[PDB]
């Protein structure tokens, strides 16, 4: 499923991401925009053999199991395919674990390079929240 900007902001707010670990809602919507273009079915393989899955592009080397990433951990304890569902619950729950890991949202390369230090509130403007 491809989410609309406000539709996703609403779904994320409902799942408790707004201000989670100090990151305002605009941050999460901006990260989603640039990581997957709001598409829950997005996948991208990396040079190290791992693969990123879903709207927040969660990596298979540490967070989920896709059966083809040797010596990988499954810290979120879920099959990576669950991260492609139209229901973002699984992605959100796993993202909450990732952002609490110590490096905050810097764990998402697109957020660090394209959202960090920008006016992220813009991503939720005009939204009925």
Curated annotation (Swiss-Prot):
Ranges in coiled-coil conformation: none
Biological process terms in GO annotation: cell wall macromolecule catabolic process; defense response to bacterium; defense response to Gram-negative bacterium; defense response to Gram-positive bacterium; killing of cells of another organism
Protein localization: Secreted
GO molecular-function terms, A-Z: beta-N-acetylglucosaminidase activity; identical protein binding; lysozyme activity
Domain of life: Eukaryota
InterPro entries, per the entry: Glyco_hydro_22 (IPR001916), Glyco_hydro_22_CS (IPR019799), Glyco_hydro_22_lys (IPR000974), Lysozyme-like_dom_sf (IPR023346)
Ranges of residues in domain C-type lysozyme: 1-129
Tissue specificity statement from the Swiss-Prot or TrEMBL entry: In the egg white and polymorphonuclear leukocytes.
Location of the active site: 35, 52
Disulfide bridge map: 6-127, 30-115, 64-80, 76-94
Keyword Cell membrane in record: no
Reactions performed catalytically: Hydrolysis of (1->4)-beta-linkages between N-acetylmuramic acid and N-acetyl-D-glucosamine residues in a peptidoglycan and between N-acetyl-D-glucosamine residues in chitodextrins
Main location group: secreted
Residues binding substrate, per UniProt: 101
Keyword terms, alphabetized: Allergen, Antimicrobial, Bacteriolytic enzyme, Disulfide bond, Glycosidase, Hydrolase, Secreted, Signal
Function recorded in the entry: Lysozymes have primarily a bacteriolytic function; those in tissues and body fluids are associated with the monocyte-macrophage system and enhance the activity of immunoagents. Has bacteriolytic activity against M.luteus.
Entry's family note: Belongs to the glycosyl hydrolase 22 family.
Note: Lysozyme C is capable of both hydrolysis and transglycosylation; it also shows a slight esterase activity. It acts rapidly on both peptide-substituted and unsubstituted peptidoglycan, and slowly on chitin oligosaccharides.
The protein, known as: Lysozyme C
